[PDB]
Q: What sequence folds into this?
């Protein structure tokens, strides 16, 4: 089972640099080209560069010479991409991929991708979120089924992790993408259950904000 | 660099119908060895991109043959014979014939389903938040279709445009509907000065506005 695991989200100060890692397993690392791709604001892909771990040979897209430097450690089967002197345009999601084109066969083998590493270039301060439970009053939807909510506000930077009943309750859940306003993000999630379940058995919102080591549980009381 | 132009930007198709996406290049993609390096990738919501097709028409391993690709020179087409729910996502054509490799801007495929009315829930500020001096009123408008919807907040009859924060989910791969959250934030002081809080929505499924509200008082 071929896998590529990338490092976590990075908050970088303007003018500084970061080193992203792409750890592989399941195939011979030295025999295939690893490519890095950039993704800005949803749909908008750009090819950065490629490296062949076996020899250290690299090819760069002109736009990124001096911006990106690719390396590969054969002993740990890890590919790295260093980004230097970060600015506005560098905030994006970066993917590494064992693309699969075999130059000698003029054909392809399956492509495998990492999960992506989000880089945020900002000088705004890290802020822990406030988690607020949302119990119905008119958001009861009458009998049959009732929807509860959880409001996570005033945090920076992304991401935040929100689960219900520690992952147990996953159906009838809608988690909305965070929206930035005044240097702080706001996120919310709703869960729809039947009148028989709540309030009878408890529903709890779990929130984690790694950047600030915040982990908080909020039970939705009537 | 080679410019790749995809059309349409978005396409709405019902399950069982065919779909086709077009990709045009500013230079011929015929490489000097006679091969045409044009690939098609699919990026499903929240997932990494995946190659569907290589060399214009060759399907990658594990890709359903309901998907086909054709074209030559500067014009290429991806066709899906019968759309299924799992085809939801953004499709991209990417050329590798000319250095550097370049991508098309993407085509979002959305599954057209029957009109669905939003289920609306409204929530007053929690005690916790009020204690801190803030007050957010939240309105969830769940499982509706089409995505086109307009929400307005009204406090005691007059529209409130400031302090509103909206967010939409992408199309759900289970029922093909959309959901949206709308949060109005005020100070605790101002919250306690008004009575009625209304979340009002305009949607194709109703000739009159869809309303949800509450009156804050005491007891
Ligand atoms: C530019 C030039 N051409 C070739 O050798 C053929 C490369 C074809 P490809 O499908 O691997 O290109 C791509 C590789 C990677 C991506 N990607 O999206 O990662 C896209 C296309 C060269 O290297 O001399
Ligand atoms: Zn092939
Ligand atoms: Zn060329
Ligand atoms: Zn040439
Ligand atoms: Zn008034
Ligand atoms: Zn008045
Ligand atoms: Zn008033
Ligand atoms: Zn009044």
A:
């Amino acid at each position: 089972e071929m896998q590529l695991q990338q490092s976590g989200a990075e908050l970088l100060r303007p003018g500084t640099s970061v080193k992203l890692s792409c750890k592989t397993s399941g195939y011979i690392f030295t025999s295939y080209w690893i490519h890095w791709v950039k993704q800005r604001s949803g749909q908008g892909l750009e090819w950065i560069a490629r490296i062949y771990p076996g020899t250290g040979s690299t090819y760069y897209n002109e736009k990124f010479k001096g911006k990106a430097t690719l390396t590969a450690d054969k002993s740990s089967s890890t590919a790295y991409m260093q980004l230097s002197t970060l600015k506005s345009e560098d905030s994006a999601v970066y993917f590494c991929t064992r693309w699969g084109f075999i130059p000698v066969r003029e054909d392809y083998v399956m492509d495998y991708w990492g999960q992506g590493t989000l880089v945020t270039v900002s000088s705004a301060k890290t802020t822990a979120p406030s988690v607020y439970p949302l119990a119905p009053v008119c958001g009861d939807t009458t009998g049959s089924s009732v929807t509860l909510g959880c409001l996570v506000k005033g945090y920076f930077p992304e991401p935040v992790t929100l689960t219900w009943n520690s992952g147990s309750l996953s159906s009838g859940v809608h988690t909305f993408p965070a929206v930035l306003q005044s240097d702080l993000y706001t996120l919310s999630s709703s869960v729809t259950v039947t009148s028989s379940t709540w309030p009878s058995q408890s529903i709890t919102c779990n929130v984690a904000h790694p950047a600030s080591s915040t982990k908080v549980d909020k039970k939705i009381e009537p | 660099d080679i410019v790749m132009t995809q059309s349409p930007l978005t396409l709405s198709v019902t399950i069982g119908q065919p779909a086709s996406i077009s990709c045009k290049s500013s230079q011929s993609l015929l490489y000097s060895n006679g091969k045409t390096y044009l690939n098609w990738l699919l990026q499903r919501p929240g997932q990494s991109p995946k190659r569907l097709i290589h060399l214009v028409s060759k399907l990658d391993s594990g890709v359903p043959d309901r998907i086909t690709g054709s074209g030559s020179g500067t014009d290429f087409t991806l066709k899906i014979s019968r759309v299924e729910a799992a085809d939801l996502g953004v499709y991209y054509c990417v050329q590798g014939t000319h250095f550097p490799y370049t991508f098309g801007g993407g085509t979002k495929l959305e599954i057209l389903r029957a009109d669905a009315a939003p289920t609306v829930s409204i929530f007053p500020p929690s005690s916790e938040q009020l204690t801190s001096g803030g007050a957010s009123v939240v309105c969830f408008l769940n499982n509706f279709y089409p995505k086109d919807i307009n929400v307005k907040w009204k406090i005691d009859g007059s529209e409130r445009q400031n302090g509103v924060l909206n967010s939409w989910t992408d199309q759900d791969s289970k029922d093909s509907t959309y959901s949206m959250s709308s949060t109005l934030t005020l100070t605790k002081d101002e919250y306690e000065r008004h009575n009625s809080y209304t979340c009002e929505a305009t949607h194709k499924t109703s000739t009159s506005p869809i309303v949800k509200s509450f009156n804050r008082n005491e007891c």
